[PDB]
mmCIF file with all atom_site columns, C-alpha atoms in Angstrom:
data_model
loop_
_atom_site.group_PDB
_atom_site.id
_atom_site.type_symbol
_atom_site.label_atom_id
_atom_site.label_alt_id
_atom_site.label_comp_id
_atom_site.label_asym_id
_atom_site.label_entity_id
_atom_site.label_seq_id
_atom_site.pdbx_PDB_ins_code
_atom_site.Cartn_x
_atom_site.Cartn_y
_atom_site.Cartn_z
_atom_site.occupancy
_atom_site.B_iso_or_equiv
_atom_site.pdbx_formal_charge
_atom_site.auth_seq_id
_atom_site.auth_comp_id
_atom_site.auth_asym_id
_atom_site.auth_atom_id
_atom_site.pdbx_PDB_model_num
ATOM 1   C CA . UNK A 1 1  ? 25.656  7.487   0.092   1.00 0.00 ? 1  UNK A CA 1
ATOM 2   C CA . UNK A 1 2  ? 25.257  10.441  0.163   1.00 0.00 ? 2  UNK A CA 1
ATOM 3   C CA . UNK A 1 3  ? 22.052  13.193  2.620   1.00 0.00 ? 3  UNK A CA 1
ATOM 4   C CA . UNK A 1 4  ? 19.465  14.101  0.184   1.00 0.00 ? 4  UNK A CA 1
ATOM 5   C CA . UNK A 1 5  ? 18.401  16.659  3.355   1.00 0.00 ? 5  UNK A CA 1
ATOM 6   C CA . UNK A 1 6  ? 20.694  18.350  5.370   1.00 0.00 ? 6  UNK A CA 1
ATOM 7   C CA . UNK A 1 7  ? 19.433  18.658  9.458   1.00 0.00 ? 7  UNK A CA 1
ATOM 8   C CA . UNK A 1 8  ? 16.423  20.882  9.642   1.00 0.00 ? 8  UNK A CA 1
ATOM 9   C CA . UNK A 1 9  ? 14.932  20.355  6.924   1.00 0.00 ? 9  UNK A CA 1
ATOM 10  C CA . UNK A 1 10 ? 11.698  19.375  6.754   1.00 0.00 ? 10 UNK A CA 1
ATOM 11  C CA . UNK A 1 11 ? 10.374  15.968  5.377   1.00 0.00 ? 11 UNK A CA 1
ATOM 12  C CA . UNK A 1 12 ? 7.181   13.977  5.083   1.00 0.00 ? 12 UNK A CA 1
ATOM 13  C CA . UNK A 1 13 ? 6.001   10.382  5.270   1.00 0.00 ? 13 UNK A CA 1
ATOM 14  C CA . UNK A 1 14 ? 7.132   7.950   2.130   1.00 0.00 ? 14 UNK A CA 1
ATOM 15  C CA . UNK A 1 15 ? 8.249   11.569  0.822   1.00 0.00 ? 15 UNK A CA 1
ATOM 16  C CA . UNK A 1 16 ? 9.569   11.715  -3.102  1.00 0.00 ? 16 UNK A CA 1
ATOM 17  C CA . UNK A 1 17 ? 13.028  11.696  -2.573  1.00 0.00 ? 17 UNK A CA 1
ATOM 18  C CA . UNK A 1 18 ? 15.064  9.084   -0.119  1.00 0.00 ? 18 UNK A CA 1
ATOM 19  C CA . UNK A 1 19 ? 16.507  11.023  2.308   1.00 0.00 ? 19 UNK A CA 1
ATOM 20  C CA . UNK A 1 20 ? 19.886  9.281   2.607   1.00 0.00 ? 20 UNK A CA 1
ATOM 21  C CA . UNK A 1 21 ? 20.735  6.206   -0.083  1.00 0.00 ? 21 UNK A CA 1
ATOM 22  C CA . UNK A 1 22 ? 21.690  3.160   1.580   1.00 0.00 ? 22 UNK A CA 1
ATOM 23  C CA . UNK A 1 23 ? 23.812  0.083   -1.267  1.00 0.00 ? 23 UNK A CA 1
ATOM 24  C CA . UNK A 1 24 ? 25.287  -3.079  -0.780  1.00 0.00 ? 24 UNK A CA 1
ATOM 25  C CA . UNK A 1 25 ? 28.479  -3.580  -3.006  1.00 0.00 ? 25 UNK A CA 1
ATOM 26  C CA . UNK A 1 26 ? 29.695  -7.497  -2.057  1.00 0.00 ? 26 UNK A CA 1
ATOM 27  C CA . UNK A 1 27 ? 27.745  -8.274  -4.869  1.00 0.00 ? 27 UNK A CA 1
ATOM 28  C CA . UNK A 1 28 ? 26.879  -6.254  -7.926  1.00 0.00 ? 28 UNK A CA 1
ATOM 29  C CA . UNK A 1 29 ? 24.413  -6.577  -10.775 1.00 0.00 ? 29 UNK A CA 1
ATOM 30  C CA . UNK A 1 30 ? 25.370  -6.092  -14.139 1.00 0.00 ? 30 UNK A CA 1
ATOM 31  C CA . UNK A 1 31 ? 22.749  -5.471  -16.759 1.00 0.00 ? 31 UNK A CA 1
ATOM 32  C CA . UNK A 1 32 ? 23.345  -6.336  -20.434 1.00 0.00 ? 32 UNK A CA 1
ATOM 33  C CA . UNK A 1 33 ? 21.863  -4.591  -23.064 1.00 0.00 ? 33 UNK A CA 1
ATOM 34  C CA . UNK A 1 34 ? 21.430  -7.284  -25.897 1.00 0.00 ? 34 UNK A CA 1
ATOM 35  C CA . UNK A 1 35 ? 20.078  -6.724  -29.276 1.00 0.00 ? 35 UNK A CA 1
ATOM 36  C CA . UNK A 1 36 ? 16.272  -8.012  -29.255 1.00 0.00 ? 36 UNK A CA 1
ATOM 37  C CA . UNK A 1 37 ? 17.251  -9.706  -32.816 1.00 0.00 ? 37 UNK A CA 1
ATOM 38  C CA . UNK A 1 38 ? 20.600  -11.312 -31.844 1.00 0.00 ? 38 UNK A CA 1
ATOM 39  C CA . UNK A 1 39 ? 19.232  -13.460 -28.869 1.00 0.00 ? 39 UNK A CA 1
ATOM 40  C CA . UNK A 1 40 ? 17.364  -15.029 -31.285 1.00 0.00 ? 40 UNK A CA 1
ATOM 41  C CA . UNK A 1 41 ? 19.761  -16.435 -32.901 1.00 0.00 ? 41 UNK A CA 1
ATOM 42  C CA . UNK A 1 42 ? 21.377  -17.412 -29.593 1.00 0.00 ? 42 UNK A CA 1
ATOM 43  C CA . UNK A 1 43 ? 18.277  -19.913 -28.772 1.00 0.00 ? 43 UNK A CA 1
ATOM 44  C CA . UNK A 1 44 ? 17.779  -19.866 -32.602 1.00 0.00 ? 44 UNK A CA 1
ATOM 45  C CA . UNK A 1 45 ? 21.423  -21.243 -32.817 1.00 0.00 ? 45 UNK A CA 1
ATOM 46  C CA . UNK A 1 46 ? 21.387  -23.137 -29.210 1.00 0.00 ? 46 UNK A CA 1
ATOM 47  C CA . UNK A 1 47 ? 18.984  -25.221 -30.614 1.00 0.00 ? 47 UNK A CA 1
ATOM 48  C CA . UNK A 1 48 ? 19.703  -24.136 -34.423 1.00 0.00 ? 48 UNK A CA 1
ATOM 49  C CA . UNK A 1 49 ? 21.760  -25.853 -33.859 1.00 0.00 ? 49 UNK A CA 1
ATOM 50  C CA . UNK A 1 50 ? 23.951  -26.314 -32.294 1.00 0.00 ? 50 UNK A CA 1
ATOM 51  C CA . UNK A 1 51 ? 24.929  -24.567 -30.507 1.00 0.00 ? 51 UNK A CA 1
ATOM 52  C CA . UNK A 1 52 ? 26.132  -25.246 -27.085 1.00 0.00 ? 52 UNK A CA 1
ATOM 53  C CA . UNK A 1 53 ? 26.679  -23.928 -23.231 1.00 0.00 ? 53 UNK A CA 1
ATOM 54  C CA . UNK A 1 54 ? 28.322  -24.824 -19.867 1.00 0.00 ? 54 UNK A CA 1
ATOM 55  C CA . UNK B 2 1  ? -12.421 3.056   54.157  1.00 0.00 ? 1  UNK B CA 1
ATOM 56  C CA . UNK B 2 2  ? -9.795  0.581   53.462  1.00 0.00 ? 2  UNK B CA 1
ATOM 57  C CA . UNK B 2 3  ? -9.919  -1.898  56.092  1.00 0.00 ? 3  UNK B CA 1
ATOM 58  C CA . UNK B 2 4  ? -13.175 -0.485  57.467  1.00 0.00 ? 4  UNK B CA 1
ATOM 59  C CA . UNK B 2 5  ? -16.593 -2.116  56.762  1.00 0.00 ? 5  UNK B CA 1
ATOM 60  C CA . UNK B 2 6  ? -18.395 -1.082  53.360  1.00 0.00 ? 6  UNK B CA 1
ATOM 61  C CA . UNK B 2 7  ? -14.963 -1.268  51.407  1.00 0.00 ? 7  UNK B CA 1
ATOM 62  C CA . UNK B 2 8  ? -15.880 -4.478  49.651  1.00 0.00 ? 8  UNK B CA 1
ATOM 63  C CA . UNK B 2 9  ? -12.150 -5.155  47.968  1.00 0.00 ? 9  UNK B CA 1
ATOM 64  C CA . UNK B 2 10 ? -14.091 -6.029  45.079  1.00 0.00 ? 10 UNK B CA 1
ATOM 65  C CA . UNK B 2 11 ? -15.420 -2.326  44.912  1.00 0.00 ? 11 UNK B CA 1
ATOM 66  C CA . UNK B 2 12 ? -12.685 0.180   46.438  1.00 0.00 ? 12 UNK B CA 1
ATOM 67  C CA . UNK B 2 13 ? -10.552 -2.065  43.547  1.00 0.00 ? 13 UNK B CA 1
ATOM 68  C CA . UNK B 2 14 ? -13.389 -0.824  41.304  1.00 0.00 ? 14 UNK B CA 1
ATOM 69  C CA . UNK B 2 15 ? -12.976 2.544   41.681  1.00 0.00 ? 15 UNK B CA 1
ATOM 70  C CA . UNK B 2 16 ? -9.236  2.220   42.090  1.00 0.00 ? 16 UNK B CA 1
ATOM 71  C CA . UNK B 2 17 ? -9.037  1.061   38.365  1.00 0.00 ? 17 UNK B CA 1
ATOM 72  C CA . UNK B 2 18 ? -11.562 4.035   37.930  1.00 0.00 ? 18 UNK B CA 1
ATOM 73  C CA . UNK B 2 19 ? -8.477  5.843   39.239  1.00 0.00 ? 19 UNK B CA 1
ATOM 74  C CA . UNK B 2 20 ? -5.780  3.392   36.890  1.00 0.00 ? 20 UNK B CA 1
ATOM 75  C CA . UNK B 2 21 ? -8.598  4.012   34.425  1.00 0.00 ? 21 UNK B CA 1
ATOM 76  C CA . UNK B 2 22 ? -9.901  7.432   34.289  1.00 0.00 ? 22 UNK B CA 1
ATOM 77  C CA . UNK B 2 23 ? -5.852  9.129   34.871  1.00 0.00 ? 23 UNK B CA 1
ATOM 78  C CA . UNK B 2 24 ? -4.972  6.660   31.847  1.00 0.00 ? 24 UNK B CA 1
ATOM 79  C CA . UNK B 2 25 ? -7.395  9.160   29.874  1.00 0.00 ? 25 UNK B CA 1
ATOM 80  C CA . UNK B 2 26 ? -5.663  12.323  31.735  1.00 0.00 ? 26 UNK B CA 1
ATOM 81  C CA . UNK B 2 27 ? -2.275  10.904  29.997  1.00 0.00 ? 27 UNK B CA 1
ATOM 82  C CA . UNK B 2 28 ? -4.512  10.271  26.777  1.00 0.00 ? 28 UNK B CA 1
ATOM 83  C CA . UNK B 2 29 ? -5.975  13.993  26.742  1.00 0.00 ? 29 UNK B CA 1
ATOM 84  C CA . UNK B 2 30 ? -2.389  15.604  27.832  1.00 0.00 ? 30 UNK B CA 1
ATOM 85  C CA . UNK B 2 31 ? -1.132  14.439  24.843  1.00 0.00 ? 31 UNK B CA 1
ATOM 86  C CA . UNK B 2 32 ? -4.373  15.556  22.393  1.00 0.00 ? 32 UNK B CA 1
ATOM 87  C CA . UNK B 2 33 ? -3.401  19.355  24.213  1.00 0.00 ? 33 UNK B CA 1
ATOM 88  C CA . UNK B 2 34 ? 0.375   18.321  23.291  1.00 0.00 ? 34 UNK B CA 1
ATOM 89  C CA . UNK B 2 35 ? -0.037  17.242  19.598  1.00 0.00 ? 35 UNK B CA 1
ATOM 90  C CA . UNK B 2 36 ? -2.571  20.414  18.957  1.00 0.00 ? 36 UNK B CA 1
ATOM 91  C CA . UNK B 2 37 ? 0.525   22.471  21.025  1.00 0.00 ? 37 UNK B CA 1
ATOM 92  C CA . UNK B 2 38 ? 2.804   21.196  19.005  1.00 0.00 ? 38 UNK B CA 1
ATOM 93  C CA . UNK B 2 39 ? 0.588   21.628  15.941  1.00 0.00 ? 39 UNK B CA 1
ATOM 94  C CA . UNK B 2 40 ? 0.018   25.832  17.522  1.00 0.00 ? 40 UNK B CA 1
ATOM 95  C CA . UNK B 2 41 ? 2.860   27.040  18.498  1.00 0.00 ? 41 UNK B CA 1
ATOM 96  C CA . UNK B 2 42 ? 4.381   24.438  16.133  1.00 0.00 ? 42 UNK B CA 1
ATOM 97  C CA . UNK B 2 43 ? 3.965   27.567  13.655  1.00 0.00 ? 43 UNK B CA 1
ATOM 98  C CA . UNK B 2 44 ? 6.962   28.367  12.809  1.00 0.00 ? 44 UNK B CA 1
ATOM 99  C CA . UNK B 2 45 ? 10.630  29.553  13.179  1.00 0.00 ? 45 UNK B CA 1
ATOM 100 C CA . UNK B 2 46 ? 12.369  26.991  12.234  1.00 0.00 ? 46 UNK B CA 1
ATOM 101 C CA . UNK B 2 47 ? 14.673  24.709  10.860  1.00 0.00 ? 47 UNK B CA 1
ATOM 102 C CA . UNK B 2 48 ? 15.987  23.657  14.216  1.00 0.00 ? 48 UNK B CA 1
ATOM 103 C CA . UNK B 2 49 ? 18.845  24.872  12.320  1.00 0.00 ? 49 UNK B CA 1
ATOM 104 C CA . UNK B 2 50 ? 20.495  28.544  13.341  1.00 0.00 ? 50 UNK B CA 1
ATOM 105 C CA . UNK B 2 51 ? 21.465  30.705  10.776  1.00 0.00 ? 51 UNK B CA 1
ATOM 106 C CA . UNK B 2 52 ? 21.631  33.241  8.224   1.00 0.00 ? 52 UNK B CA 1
ATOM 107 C CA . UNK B 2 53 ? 18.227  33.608  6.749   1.00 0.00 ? 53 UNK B CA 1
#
């Protein structure tokens, strides 16, 4: 990504802020917000039943 | 004495490591003036950077 210092400027050990951000696209995550309630249902229903999966 | 009678190999190598040894500390110390050197005159200009300030 992108510097979070330009040269010169002074940093310390473990400091706050990454200096430059390194990412690895191949793969991606995707995280899915699910309604806490709904899921339920989902093992609720997968074994409600029925329901099913792959 | 090398060569010559009283050397002992044994103890001219003895003192010879007192050499290896002891200048191993003069490297050691150089350094303790260099890191305090570079923690003196460390102080301050600047951001190796040159520019408008």
């Amino acid at each position: 990504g992108k510097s979070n210092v330009t040269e010169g400027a002074l940093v310390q050990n473990g400091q706050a802020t990454a200096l430059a951000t390194v990412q690895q696209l191949d793969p991606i995550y995707v995280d899915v917000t699910q309604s806490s309630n709904d899921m339920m249902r989902l093992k609720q229903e997968l074994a409600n039943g029925t329901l099913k999966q792959e | 004495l090398l060569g010559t009678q009283y050397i002992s190999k044994q103890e001219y190598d003895q003192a010879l490591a007192d050499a290896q040894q002891a200048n191993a500390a003069v490297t050691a110390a150089k350094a303790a003036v260099e890191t305090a050197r570079i923690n003196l005159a460390y102080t301050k200009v600047t951001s190796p950077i040159s520019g408008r300030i």
